[PDB]
Amino acid sequence: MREIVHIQAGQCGNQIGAKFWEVISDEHGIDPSGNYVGDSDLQLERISVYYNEASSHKYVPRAILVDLEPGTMDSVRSGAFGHLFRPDNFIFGQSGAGNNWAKGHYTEGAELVDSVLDVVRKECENCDCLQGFQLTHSLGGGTGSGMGTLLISKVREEYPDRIMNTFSVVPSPKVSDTVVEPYNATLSIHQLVENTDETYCIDNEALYDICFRTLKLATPTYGDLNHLVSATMSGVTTSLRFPGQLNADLRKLAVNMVPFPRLHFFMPGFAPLTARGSQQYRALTVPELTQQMFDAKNMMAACDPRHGRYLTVATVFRGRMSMKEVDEQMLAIQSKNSSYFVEWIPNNVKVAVCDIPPRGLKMSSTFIGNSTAIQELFKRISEQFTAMFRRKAFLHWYTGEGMDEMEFTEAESNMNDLVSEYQQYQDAT
Amino acid sequence: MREIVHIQAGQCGNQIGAKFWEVISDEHGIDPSGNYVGDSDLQLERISVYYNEASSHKYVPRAILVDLEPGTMDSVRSGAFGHLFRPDNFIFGQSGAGNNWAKGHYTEGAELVDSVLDVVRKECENCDCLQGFQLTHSLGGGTGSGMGTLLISKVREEYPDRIMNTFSVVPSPKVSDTVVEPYNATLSIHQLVENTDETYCIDNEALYDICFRTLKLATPTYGDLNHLVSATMSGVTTSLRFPGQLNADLRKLAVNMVPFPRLHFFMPGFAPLTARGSQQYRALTVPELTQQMFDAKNMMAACDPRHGRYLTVATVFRGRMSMKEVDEQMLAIQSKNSSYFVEWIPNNVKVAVCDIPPRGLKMSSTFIGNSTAIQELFKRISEQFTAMFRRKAFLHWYTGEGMDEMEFTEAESNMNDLVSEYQQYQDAT
Amino acid sequence: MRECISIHVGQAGVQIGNACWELYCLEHGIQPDGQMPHHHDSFNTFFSETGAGKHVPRAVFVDLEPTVIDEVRTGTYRQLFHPEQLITGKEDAANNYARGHYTIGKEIIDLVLDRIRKLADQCTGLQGFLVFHSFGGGTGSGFTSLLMERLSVDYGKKSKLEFSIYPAPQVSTAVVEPYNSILTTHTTLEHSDCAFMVDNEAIYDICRRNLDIERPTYTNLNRLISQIVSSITASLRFDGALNVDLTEFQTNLVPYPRIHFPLATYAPVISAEKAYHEQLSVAEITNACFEPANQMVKCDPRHGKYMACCLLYRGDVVPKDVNAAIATIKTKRSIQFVDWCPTGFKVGINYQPPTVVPGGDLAKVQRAVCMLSNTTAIAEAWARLDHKFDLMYAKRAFVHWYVGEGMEEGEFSEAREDMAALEKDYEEVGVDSVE
Amino acid sequence: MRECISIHVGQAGVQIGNACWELYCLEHGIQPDGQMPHHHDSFNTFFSETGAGKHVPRAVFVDLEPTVIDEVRTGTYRQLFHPEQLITGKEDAANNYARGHYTIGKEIIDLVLDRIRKLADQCTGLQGFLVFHSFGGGTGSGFTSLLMERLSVDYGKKSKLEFSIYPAPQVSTAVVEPYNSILTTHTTLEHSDCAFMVDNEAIYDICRRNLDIERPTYTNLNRLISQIVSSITASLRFDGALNVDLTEFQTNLVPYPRIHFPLATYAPVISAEKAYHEQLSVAEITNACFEPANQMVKCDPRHGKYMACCLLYRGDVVPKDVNAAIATIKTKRSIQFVDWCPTGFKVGINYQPPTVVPGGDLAKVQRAVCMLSNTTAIAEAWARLDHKFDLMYAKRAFVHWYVGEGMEEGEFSEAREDMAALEKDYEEVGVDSVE
């Protein structure tokens, strides 16, 4: 019950999804062929939430892989853990978004969004009681941004009651992997703050920093970053895919973390993060995890929390632990950082506890902080957008697909309004 | 309980610390890997005071190794009894202090002191009830002097209640291993008399003399001198790391040995010291130890006690002995040397007795004398400083890092005031 | 022939019930499969019996999320419960009162009431209801409010007892606890005969200090609350020198229609190693019960006055000692009842000692005492919740979920007015009389 | 039914208590685990009893450093004590009075008082208090002063007896002994009913000369002081031809409110090899008690006058011999009481002989006598301490620790004034009366 549908847009979304399904299959003991070879019945007691039991006793992920260029699709298809996706799912076009948002939302996307929605509808009717949607996409790449926003708008039209999750890879502050990414970011954020329940902001910069310093890895390949994001997502969903002394669901997180309709952008975090050698020289206790999760050097979003306040915080543990210990740790961490939390939300730590470790470890933890610091991010992007709009640079590519300036004017105004709201609530009293 | 944090600054500090942790691990029966293979539970009944029990039943020393050049750090890391320090502790820079104090306290140290304080804070919060800090450093080398003084000032800012121990290797009177050591000594002493509770002055000259005459060794390598200082430190702490018929703690020594806030410089001493052959030809009785500990030829500070008076004296024994015997010996030694003690402090011998020998003996003893003779030391250094300041020799290296002459003027005035206080109390009546 | 059904709402209720029914099955020598290889009948009051030697509980486990109920169905206590009772919803209220009282629970309330009616009509001397429900969870608050209103409509005059989990002052697992608490209190204030305040924080404290376990799981808190419940029902379920029925509880501990929130307390609670080194006098355990550090709600009794107390003893107890101990307690000044109630005790004695659950944490004792005390200190606790509510309402935080789920702001304002009125009533009663 | 609790403060108190409770458990045939395989009840006065054959002591071992208490918990006497009593702090006073009376001990004084109150209320015929505490240690002085003030506030009129370890004239293990001694004396001078002066130096002397052991450990001094305590309490704990209770002690040996510092003495103390070669006459042992070399405080009695004496005999004793011996003692001139007290004796006889602890140093005797003597020689000892204080205060040495730990210099001056007043009172009493 409470089945979840997985959508993967853009190249980053698809790669993250490949690693994500690898992780999930490892969790439930699923062979690459798609048949169960596990050992613990609890794996199958909720196997339906992400998988569908196809006949002859096989399992197929409830995935809907979307793209506009067959390259990465075929890469996924050929590689291992690709032979179990249901082959009818791989929707792809030929033109390619060309790293443009106008193509990804108006011209090219309008031709595949119908087929995507049809497969979505088939999967929805297949499920018993739909729980919600999780969309894995970028914010820079044209396909990800444009087509994901279009799909979100259409789905919200057809399912205004379900819950919506997005794992959007926000552009990094220092580097810029693309050139027009401010435009894509602004338009995508406009659509998201329109029609999304929660948005898990991530930067590649923070993941680089974590893989470098904390994990002591000088050679971070994209496999590792995607592995980290996959572990975060698995930690988010294990609260319902598994039994727990204090269980959680996606709707619980949405209610707890989203005080106002618009302010629903979360920065995630994971713990423990230990190098290969520096592991046996540290104790794995709940206080250690809790103290690890609260610092700028372990936030997957490149913005110091100290510059603002945590509006709300959610914390999902795993593995066997003692509830009193967790409560004591949360009390201490809420006490000593009193200036780091908003005054008018007393007891602002949502807690959930699962019963299964994420494999290999004794106990893990996932942090989901809805703070005001992220305003800086938007601030940054907004400014960049403004600059690249003041000269109307690159404007012709977007204008040529039917979009006009007033779109950009409205989107920038909307983002500035959002930043104003964040600022207002940060200094509320 | 009463956990102690160990800091090691400068090359001498780090080598002394390596030998010191070797000694401690030998005491508690700790394998080089960091796991306990001992045989007596009393080793583990207080194992927490210096160690932390890391998971999978291992032990890691509560060490914080600091330096500005990775050379000696790597030497420690490669050598045995280095594989159990927690690898995240090894804080080191790249520029190196260059045997300058200005670099070690203003320019280079200002870049690593923050990370050092952060690891300090982590360890402090890890402990249950912090007892105090022991800093092992030099007074000549730039790193040791400058960075240790900076760390002491910062820690005293953040922990004005804990107790502070320093094992500062004072420059020898005859030889001079460096050229600018008067400047480093004066500045370091200024900071120490500002913000330290007790300072264990040591000279390499006295250790040379002891290894030569008393131990009958013609080939004293630095390993042996560091071994002696390590034995002294272990003797100081065994009063709380182990049960005893009359136990002592660091705060007890601080209260007993420091009559006035400034006059807190102690000369240590150890006994018994027997050559390899001349051991079986001597009786190991409490009178023998007591008579050994009171003579210039067994003081680890190069200054004859007879030139002044013992302001106070502390004496920490080990191994099984009879209290009445110790009391009788102290009475006799206080009687016959009546001119060697200050008139206005009656019964000026603090006594403590442990129950465990220093491993390989029947009974040992450690002497901690706070005397007035040490004024000569400062006198000497002061004069040297004055000379090297009269011509302003070497002044440009220190001036170029922001420091100015008035710093030196104030520091020299402060040291002269301290010597005046020592002289005043020496001839008090 | 004095039956009493149990209704467990929400995850807290279901787990507490797991503990409670484990305890019962241990007490009467009942195997997990309902078989059984001073006793009377005894078990008839809680266990109905079928043709074979198989007994089934009179419990109705209702939830909107099938996870915990599925754990129950898979646990060792699978064969026990009547499978029709284990009512499971589809989507839990997700810590939202409106979902748990207007949208979702509205679609299985009828099935729950139907099973309730079947179980009631199969009984003859029905005494009353035991609702095991938390206070913060959405299902707990909303569904319990709905169910209490429905039962009060159906069963006009019968006992209705709740075991709420009062939200702690400083440890809060939820974020919207004030909203659920205020709404469910405003609703249940007119229907619940007698609630039973218990908190998790106080039980953590007790487990750490008295039982000397530093890392307790929810299993331990559940076992303690199950022991409290068993001590409450031992009068019905056993032969005692001075028995007491739930109607006596509601008559004694409820001076006024609204002020019916007594807090629980249990004694002795000592570890197995500390079982010796003390003879456990009944006067000693009475003093332990009145010790402000032993109460199971984080409220200092010294800041208020005990309007009423009810002490239920069990084991080798002798009434004279109880009389002497209570006289001594009345003598002391720090335990100051209200002037207008000169008789502040109901005493009950049972012959059956408490039984220790194997694999448990407590020690085999011969005497035990559960105190249910209605005081005025609890009033201050309401203030705290009120305060929280005010802040979280001053910014209209989280309001959109409740608004869009079948509720209006005027309802929030009305519930705030009601809580203010209750606090006013507590303050007014706390004062002394003239002339 | 005449109970008396024991309170051990500081390391000295705890080790002395180890010895004392070893001695008791040996006396009444009590195994270390509280079991037991002329006697009456006897042990009830010091041992409370639980349901099983397990008895527990009425002791409260309090310390600020967990080392020695941990040794106790690990020693052979682990099963004995009630684990709740073994109160341990975190950081010891470190031979600092201010820490032991203002800063640290202030944070566990409440727990200690709570355990005291529990133990007292579990008793019925409580006689009084036995504080075992040193004088130089910081915990000893500070914590004992605080505890005595608190108890005197709580228990208005009850016996309060201390066993201080008077700082020796020449052997001092500490360096700040004068400060702790003066402060704790100025405090306890208004609360302690009767102290009991004992010193380590005199016990060293006695062990060397009489027992012929040249290298004694603290174990031996502790055993001797435990024997003294046992002889003090043998009246309560046994049937005697002339018994005496602690109130009799405070009535007899305390002429004035302030002068209540009697010094201890015990006899016979002879080695096993010298056990023969002497028949140990009761007159002989009386003479031994009055011998200036046998007193357990380094003060020559000949320099003062015995204001009062109390001799407690035990074993095969006959009153006529005691009368004859005391008459002879009164005849001699070198033992000169004050003129104004013509009756300078209280006599007590017990039927139980002293029992020798296996592995001990003394020999099995049939008669024993403990003398508690309040004299004027002890006054000179105060002078010595006073003198020391003056010097260590003339330079304001060590003052900064106490100043920065919650105390003022005016307090030091006031305590010096108080000690001067006490010395003045001793001198004034020492003089003779006119007319």
Ligand SMILES: Nc1nc2c(ncn2[C@@H]2O[C@H](COP(=O)(O)OP(=O)(O)OP(=O)(O)O)[C@@H](O)[C@H]2O)c(=O)[nH]1
């Ligand atoms: N005493 C005790 N309380 C528990 C236990 N498990 C959960 N709780 C309480 O349950 C509260 C969480 O809200 P719940 O009432 O459980 O919510 P729910 O029952 O899952 O129903 P929903 O709100 O719809 O999810 C916490 O505040 C806990 O105090 C338990 O095992 N023992």
Ligand SMILES: Nc1nc2c(ncn2[C@@H]2O[C@H](COP(=O)(O)OP(=O)(O)OP(=O)(O)O)[C@@H](O)[C@H]2O)c(=O)[nH]1
């Ligand atoms: N008679 C006797 N005296 C002892 C013994 N052990 C310690 N002492 C006395 O204890 C004194 C030392 O100060 P303590 O009272 O022990 O200090 P403490 O009890 O450790 O408490 P702190 O001062 O806070 O450390 C010494 O002067 C000794 O005379 C013992 O075994 N027998």
Ligand SMILES: Nc1nc2c(ncn2[C@@H]2O[C@H](COP(=O)(O)OP(=O)(O)O)[C@@H](O)[C@H]2O)c(=O)[nH]1
């Ligand atoms: N975390 C992560 N991000 C990626 C990965 N690959 C690409 N990205 C991000 O995705 C963005 C490119 O979007 P992409 O899907 O490739 O272009 P599109 O075809 O127009 O949607 C860049 O900003 C990258 O930062 C990956 O493996 N991991």
Ligand SMILES: Nc1nc2c(ncn2[C@@H]2O[C@H](COP(=O)(O)OP(=O)(O)O)[C@@H](O)[C@H]2O)c(=O)[nH]1
């Ligand atoms: N006792 C002892 N002293 C040492 C040892 N090595 C160096 N020193 C002293 O340390 C001083 C040099 O300081 P150092 O730490 O090497 O220079 P820095 O890097 O500027 O701190 C010299 O005065 C030496 O006397 C050693 O092994 N034992």
Ligand SMILES: [Mg+2]
């Ligand atoms: Mg629920």
Ligand SMILES: [Mg+2]
């Ligand atoms: Mg002590």
